[PDB]
Amino acid sequence: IARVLAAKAAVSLRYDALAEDRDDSGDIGLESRAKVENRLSQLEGRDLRTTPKVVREAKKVEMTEARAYNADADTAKA
Amino acid sequence: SSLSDQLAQVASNNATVALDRKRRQKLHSASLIYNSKTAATQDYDFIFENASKALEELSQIEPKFAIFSRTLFSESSISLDRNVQTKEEIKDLDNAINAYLLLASSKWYLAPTLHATEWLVRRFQIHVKNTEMLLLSTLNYYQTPVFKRILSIIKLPPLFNCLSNFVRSEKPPTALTMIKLFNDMDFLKLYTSYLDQCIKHNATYTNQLLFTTCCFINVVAFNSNNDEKLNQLVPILLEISAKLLASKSKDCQIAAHTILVVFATALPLKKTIILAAMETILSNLDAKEAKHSALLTICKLFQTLKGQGNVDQLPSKIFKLFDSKFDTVSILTFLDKEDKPVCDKFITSYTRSIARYDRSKLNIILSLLKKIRLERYEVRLIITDLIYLSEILEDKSQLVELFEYFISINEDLVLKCLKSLG
Amino acid sequence: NGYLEPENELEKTFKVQQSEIKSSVDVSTANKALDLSLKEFGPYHIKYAKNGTHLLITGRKGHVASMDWRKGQLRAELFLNETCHSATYLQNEQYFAVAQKKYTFIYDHEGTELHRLKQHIEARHLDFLPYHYLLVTAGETGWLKYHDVSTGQLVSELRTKAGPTMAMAQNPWNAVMHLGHSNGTVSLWSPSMPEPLVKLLSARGPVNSIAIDRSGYYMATTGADRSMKIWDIRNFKQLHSVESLPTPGTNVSISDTGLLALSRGPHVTLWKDALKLSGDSKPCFGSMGGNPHRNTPYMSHLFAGNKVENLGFVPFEDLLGVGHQTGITNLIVPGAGEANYDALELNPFETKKQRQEQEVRTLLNKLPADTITLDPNSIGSVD
Amino acid sequence: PPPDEEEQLLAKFVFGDTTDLQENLAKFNADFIFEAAWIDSDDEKIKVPILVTNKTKKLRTSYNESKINGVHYINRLRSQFEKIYPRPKWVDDESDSGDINALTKILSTTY
Amino acid sequence: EHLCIFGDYLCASTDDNSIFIYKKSDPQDKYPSEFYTKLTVTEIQGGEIVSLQHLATYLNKLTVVTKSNVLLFNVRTGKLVFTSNEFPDQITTAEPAPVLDIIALGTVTGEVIMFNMRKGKRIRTIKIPQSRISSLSFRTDGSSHLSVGTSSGDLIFYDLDRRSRIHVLKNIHRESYGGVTQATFLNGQPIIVTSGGDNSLKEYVFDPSLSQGSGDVVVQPPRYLRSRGGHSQPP
Amino acid sequence: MKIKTIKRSADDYVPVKSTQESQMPRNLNPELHPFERAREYTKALNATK
RNA sequence: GGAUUUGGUGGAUUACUAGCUAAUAGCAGAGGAAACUCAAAGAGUGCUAU
């Protein structure tokens, strides 16, 4: 940001110093300030450390006994 | 599995058993107000005393909090331990905790919530058991000083593994990692339930929606290149918007509108989905601001359509709904403003829709055509249908005038349509 | 302590299932009902610490692990490429002995070996006398050997002269050792007497297992002859002779509350109020037309195709540890453990500092070996 | 005589009972905070014994009964089935029998 | 053509819309051998037999399913107890649901009907436009999940309680060889077996949810467990 | 049914205050305390030494 | 589109006669870095330890 800020500072200054009919508003500084803030935001956003993903392991599966209806109960004699 | 692996599972299950002094130090040391040493120095009742006052301030701000005084923040709750209860008792305890987190979601900026939640952490250990619920409430506060503390005292579930780096870290979670957690398909399913609960309960607030839509949009941008996963994002994310549109809150409706627009541009989709989309968009459209946002959206959803019927007339029921919620004078005002977005094919579908169903509205079509330059095919098709009207409908001063407008502009194409049709 | 009382006369305790018990009880005991699937080095012989805080496990193929089952921490794990048979904790959970092939070994709490007992050979059963700091061994050689851990010295060596030993159990009330023999006899032994104090014929075949209640008043024995007997050891009278066993007995255990546990393969049958002189307290399998006097099983369970290696009641706990071919499982047995423990003697919540303080004072008041007698009330008489 | 309400409140404190909280927890509802077509006659006449086969033995309401008619026999059989397969939510509470749910419907049809 | 067995009764369907009933000589015999009676369904009664199905707790009734509609026959008495209402689309697959009194019916044009037989009325309907059902199966692991197999070779899973599509498995079996000829959940497990005409049998399981709470919402996609197969054409 | 099991309140046996003395439970059932008279003699012998 | 490395699972690594069970039958060398990591100890110190 020091390098980036210095570059924009020169841009703002050369406008401030030499502009024949500069409006006392700082618009060039404001827009330059916006760019460096955008430069900072993306730069600080970067994370050198690796971010681990959720682990997805395939666990062993073994079936379990499940109680089920017997159709023999249906059949009956009158 | 090795003995340690099964043993490790036992350790997780009985994390809150409060077995010995050494474990109890860790459980009690966790805090949201005080540091570890002071936290171990405090007792339950002192914590309850502060929280009870904290709830009262919240009750003044918002009445619904007063209910929890009867069940969670009661004086007799001090003696209630979760480890001793049965499953039937636990779920009822969990459900009450679930509701409290939802209301506390919008007041995290207020100090009293942080004190009030301390009792839940200390008494019921929400941080270890209701770990997912607590985070889902506080995701949008990711940069807030409260959120980093949440990470320090808590064990991340499997789905929140992306945040493991920033636990007990000077820097807060950055903007990018929020996207990474959201890119995971399973988390969207988990959050899908969470936002679903808020919509049912009318607990949603602007910081959530705007945080959601703005995270949800970024998932599209990251995943734009690969079509197949975008296809997997359709059965889930579109379902989100339909629920948001169902919410009476205008806030949710526009939140859905931001979602629909980006999907269509990112991923072209059937006209059937688009026609269904506007119909749901229009079904619960009451607020003025949503009305402005919707009309912009509806144009965009057609802007993405690039198949036969791109400019075909809206269905009869579809046509009726649009005019009721958007008078013709409204769209004229829409067509007047100079910074209007491209809506040439939507209006073209509309002009034909008027042509088929309304005889009175023809003279507005003239004004509609003047306001917006229609592309020459859109002109050709409009010419095509109007030829049928003359043969079927009685000749009218407006009807011939609509022809005369086409006589003035691009005379040759008018003959071409006549040559092909009659 | 707990219980399993019925509302309705139809509703029977033995028909209840562990799933139903797990359903009613709270989460914590549901967690105490650990199950461990170890299919490789079985069968597994289990043993719990005196305070019930630690579990010592020994697979037949040589897998020995010591852990704090309740807190889910592994204290030691041993993978001896040898046949490991039975093991026991010494004065506390820190130090345990393993009856390996051809020798017995002492190990540290991390699992580090301390000594190999050259003198104890072919030992098949292990028991530790806490108040006397004596380790006992028995095996095929018919040699009953007592070793002092504190001094690391062999106290005494007594010749059974009855062949291999199939069962051994200590009497907590007088600390006299009971050994089963192929002639159906149960022999009582003391350090200072080169011949058994008492011999008790309790079977027509080899004595598979022997159990003694905490009070030292009753005894349960199971021979390899379709049989099980209950004895009054103080006065030496037979109380019950359960011959109706569907199968021969493998292991028996008696609880703090007095529950009688019988494992006959994967038979696991529990009886309440069976250790009483009354005839109606005689254990009976099933019921004869709902006869109230008949002592029906209190609880029963099915270990599926998994022969039970040994049974362990969890001290101060309503749980039955069961060692089997595929590993370990605790069954919820309401009203089995002692609800009110005594912390001066045994504390489940013992911290390291008062544990290590407990170590010295027990050493300071170690009872001499020769104090062992049939009657513990012998000290202090005119001679 | 029964205790007074002012006694019950105080006994709540002395003994530290928590049932009242749990009843409130059970009552906690989130929203507040925020005909047979045919008939078979053979069913009525058919009488079946229970005690012959082991599995049917469970169906007994009492030890004395041994033989039961078909109509009651089914009802125990249905109850025996429901224990085997608990009744899900979709079967009982839910039935199919501009509309805002258009998007949900179209997405279901289109894969 | 079709074979159904329940209790002591063996039911066989021939191509001529004739249903033969066999019964056991003895109650304690191991299989039925004796010929009880013959029941034939006429065209007026219904269309061609789709399958023979018997639902639980129905005291000697056979739930005969036809292309035209479903028919109920009491095998013991050999009488048509009930006739289901005519269905617009031909029925292709029938599967008894784990619930009492509902049977899942699959049509030619991607329609699954959970017809309640006791009430004799439709309860629900799932739409699969531009598809042909080949197999149905319910999950009995405690999750209200329905699998619908298609001749296209595509297996879809629905959550009945949530009325949503859990996941789709694409092209598991060749469409040229009939797609998914048969797909059945294992009784009481999260596992499903699948087969087809491509000389292949595949085996899929549903893993536990990765979310500590709301596991019903976060459903893991089914994962390939194992399979056996060979050449799809002569070597 | 009537299902009761032993129930340990962790707070009762492990106090919350790190400085507090742990509750020291006691029962006078003789069965919990074997070797009535030998222990006292050994302590007597220990005292005299 | 190409290349390098790697986690997990599946099938074999012994020749294919069904499951479950309580079964004569029932059932179905010297080192280094990281820590709200896990242990084993030593010393000192603090707090009514009455």
Swiss-Prot record, chain B:
Has the keyword Lipid metabolism been applied to this entry? no
Query: Tell me, how does this one assemble?
Result: Interacts with snoRNA U3. Interacts with MPP10. Component of the ribosomal small subunit (SSU) processome composed of at least 40 protein subunits and snoRNA U3. In the absence of snoRNA3, forms a complex with other t-UTPs. This complex can associate with pre-18S ribosomal RNAs.
Could you name the domain of life of the organism this protein comes from?
A: Eukaryota
* Additional free-text comment from the UniProt record: Present with 18200 molecules/cell in log phase SD medium.
Q: What does this protein do?
A: Involved in nucleolar processing of pre-18S ribosomal RNA. Required for optimal pre-ribosomal RNA transcription by RNA polymerase I together with a subset of U3 proteins required for transcription (t-UTPs). Involved in ribosome biosynthesis.
Would the keyword Acetylation turn up in this protein's UniProt record? yes
N-acetylserine, modified sites: S1
Query: What organism, scientifically named, is this protein from?
Result: Saccharomyces cerevisiae (strain ATCC 204508 / S288c)
Cell compartment(s), UniProt: Nucleus, Nucleolus; Mitochondrion
Gene Ontology biological-process entries: endonucleolytic cleavage in 5'-ETS of tricistronic rRNA transcript (SSU-rRNA, 5.8S rRNA, LSU-rRNA); endonucleolytic cleavage in ITS1 to separate SSU-rRNA from 5.8S rRNA and LSU-rRNA from tricistronic rRNA transcript (SSU-rRNA, 5.8S rRNA, LSU-rRNA); endonucleolytic cleavage to generate mature 5'-end of SSU-rRNA from (SSU-rRNA, 5.8S rRNA, LSU-rRNA); maturation of SSU-rRNA; maturation of SSU-rRNA from tricistronic rRNA transcript (SSU-rRNA, 5.8S rRNA, LSU-rRNA); positive regulation of transcription by RNA polymerase I
Which is one GO molecular function term here?
U3 snoRNA binding
Q: Which residues form the signal peptide?
A: none
Main location (coarse class): nucleus
UniProtKB/Swiss-Prot annotation, chain C:
User: A GO CC term?
Assistant: preribosome, small subunit precursor
Instruction: Tell me the part of the parent protein that is shown.
Output: 71 to 453 of 554
Q: Does the keyword Ribonucleoprotein apply?
A: yes
Miscellaneous: Present with 5800 molecules/cell in log phase SD medium.
- Provide the protein name: U3 small nucleolar RNA-associated protein 7
Which residues form the WD repeats? 38-79, 160-199, 202-241, 244-281
Q: What is its main location?
A: nucleus
Key words of the record: Nucleus, Repeat, Ribonucleoprotein, Ribosome biogenesis, rRNA processing, WD repeat
Q: List the source organism.
A: Saccharomyces cerevisiae (strain ATCC 204508 / S288c)
Curated annotation (Swiss-Prot), chain D:
The residues that cross the membrane are: none
Q: Which residues carry this modification: Phosphoserine?
A: S95, S97
The region called Interaction with UTP21 is annotated at 35-97
Taxonomically, the superkingdom here is Eukaryota
Location(s), subcellular: Nucleus, Nucleolus
Which family does the entry's similarity section mention? Belongs to the WD repeat UTP18 family.
Question: Any further remarks?
Answer: Present with 9570 molecules/cell in log phase SD medium.
Q: Write down what this protein is called.
A: U3 small nucleolar RNA-associated protein 18
UniProtKB/Swiss-Prot annotation, chain F:
**Which family would the database say this protein is a member of?**
Belongs to the WD repeat DCAF13/WDSOF1 family.
The portion of the full protein included here is 1 to 49 of 489
Q: How does it assemble?
A: Interacts with snoRNA U3. Interacts with NOP1 and MPP10. Component of the ribosomal small subunit (SSU) processome composed of at least 40 protein subunits and snoRNA U3.
Localization per Swiss-Prot or TrEMBL: Nucleus, Nucleolus
Transmembrane residues, as ranges?
Answer: none
Q: What is this protein called?
A: Protein SOF1
Origin, by domain of life? Answer: Eukaryota
Task: Give the protein's biological function.
Answer: Required for ribosomal RNA processing.
The misc remark on file is: Present with 6620 molecules/cell in log phase SD medium.
Signal peptide feature range: none
